[PDB]
């Protein structure tokens, strides 16, 4: 998949969080519903996210 682009294992991600200098959160400053972390998928929901 590295060279042929035959990815198939992208559904295993469940979060990614991006910070700069460990005190700035990149999608932060209120944007997302949960601002400071992307969540690819949420299991156990309650806000209807």
């Amino acid at each position: 998949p590295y060279l042929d682009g035959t990815f198939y294992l992208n559904h295993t991600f469940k979060k990614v969080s991006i910070t700069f200098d460990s005190s700035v959160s990149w999608p932060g400053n209120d944007r997302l519903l949960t601002p400071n972390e992307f969540e690819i998928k949420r299991t156990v929901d309650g806000e209807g996210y």
């Binding site: 209120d30 997302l32 519903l33 949960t34 601002p35 400071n36 972390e37 806000e47 996210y49």
Partner: protein, 50 residues
């Protein structure tokens, strides 16, 4: 006749009640559960929780 012989001990004391100043009864420092204080016309939040 052998269930005459039994022993008993009280259960462990367990005290349950709300925390010290109501700790954890409101979301502080949280994502997607941030508070709001804002104008009514402006609508822009004047609270940022980290």
């Amino acid at each position: 006749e052998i269930n005459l012989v039994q022993q008993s001990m009280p259960n462990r004391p367990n005290y349950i009640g709300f925390r010290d100043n109501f700790i954890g009864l409101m979301y502080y420092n949280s994502t997607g559960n941030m508070g709001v204080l804002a104008g009514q016309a402006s609508q822009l939040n004047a609270v940022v929780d980290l």
